[PDB]
Amino acid sequence: GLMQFTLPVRLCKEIELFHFDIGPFENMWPGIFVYMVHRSCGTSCFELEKLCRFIMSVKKNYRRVPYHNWKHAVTVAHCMYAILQNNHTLFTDLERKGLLIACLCHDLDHRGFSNSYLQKFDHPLAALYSTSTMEQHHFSQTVSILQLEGHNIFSTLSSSEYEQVLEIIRKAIIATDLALYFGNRKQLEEMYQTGSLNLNNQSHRDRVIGLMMTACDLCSVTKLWPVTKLTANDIYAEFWAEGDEMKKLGIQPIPMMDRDKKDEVPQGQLGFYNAVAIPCYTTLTQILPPTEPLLKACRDNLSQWEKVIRGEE
């Protein structure tokens, strides 16, 4: 009960900032996550013995893919930690518990391929789940791990609290399907502008939590330039492998996944910041003003990609 996790002074300070990088020491990532749960939620939210066993089963069920790996999971959880810490009073006890676990589990058992590739391959998961294929799998994998003996970190919730937290995690993980982000942000934009946005409205909260999930999931665009630039290599290393597999199925991939079109990456990143990232963190900043540093970091990175195109790097 009286056993805190403590971090070295530089990590203790920088972990509070949106742009924190969790570093190349894998063995420290479980401690970083527990640290965040204790500060965000309390030292009582979870049985430490059970939380530790859950974290390591979750780690074990992420694969050794270039980007959609255990580091991504912890990175996405840290961004949620930063949003929750900067918006103390806006979130319930249950929401704080659920969303950090959701972020940790949101890409469980990812194979480094898109929903599109699963469908064109005719993968069994695409028969089991016709939309948000990988995201329904990620939620399924979360529930499985929660049902391992000694792994139910929610055991001490009431029946109804338990059903609510699993329903928060399910919506949170489904919302990381980027195909659903565009419609969710349009709706949130309309509600904010016409003044109808109401955080006591469960369907409105759901939408806001969905945008938070997209913002945390894309947070590589909100880091210092060198982190953003090196993550982009991991992201394209998966896409190009998927492009290779499309060619094997006798389908030309979209340029994004065709390693023959490496040259057009800087322009591809521009389109993505303008079409997805900037609108995401803009609408998020409108709804939750203290998340503005994510928009400011994203804009700084948009400018770095502009410099790359102009041949200044």
Ligand X SMILES: Cc1oc(-c2ccccc2)nc1CCc1nc(-c2ccccc2)cn1C
Report the C-alpha gap between 187 and 184 in whole angstroms: 5
Q: For residues 31 and 255, which CB has a smaller minimum distance to ligand X in the complex?
A: 255
Under rule CB under 5 A, residue 238 binds Mg ion: no
Q: Which one among 30, 33, 82, 107 touches Mg ion, defined by CB under 5 A?
A: 107
- Distances in Å between the Cα of 220 and the Cα atoms of 72, 105, 230, 267, 280 are 9, 17, 10, 17, 13
User: Residue 63 corresponds to which tokens in the numbers above?
Assistant: 């694969």
Report the C-alpha gap between 221 and 42 in whole angstroms: 29
For the CB of residue 249, give the shortest distance to Mg ion in the complex, in Å. 22
Report the C-alpha gap between 279 and 93 in whole angstroms: 29
304 assigned ligand-binding residue: no
Q: Considering only 51-59, 101-109, 134-142, 163-171, which stretch makes contact with Zn ion by CB under 5 A?
A: 101-109
68, 78, 110, 138: which one is catalytic? Answer: 68
Q: For residues 95 and 109, which CB has a smaller minimum distance to Mg ion in the complex?
A: 109
The number of residues that bind Mg ion (CB under 5 A) is: 2
Report the C-alpha gap between 208 and 90 in whole angstroms: 11
Cβ-Cβ contacts under 8 Å for 232 (sequence gap 6 or more): 220, 265, 269
Q: Considering only 104-112, 148-156, 220-228, 292-300, which stretch makes contact with Mg ion by CB under 5 A?
A: 104-112
> Contact residues for ligand X (CB under 6 A)?
218, 220-221, 235, 255-256, 261, 264-265, 268-269, 271-272
Catalytic-residue membership of 123: no
Report the C-alpha gap between 109 and 98 in whole angstroms: 19
Q: Count how many residues are written for the chain.
A: 313
Binders in 107-136 for Zn ion, by CB under 5 A: 107
Q: Which one among 109, 217, 238, 242 touches Zn ion, defined by CB under 5 A?
A: 217
- Which residue ranges are tagged as binding site for a divalent metal cation? 72, 106-107, 217
As annotated, the active-site residues are 68
Q: Which residues bind Mg ion (CB under 5 A)?
A: 107, 176
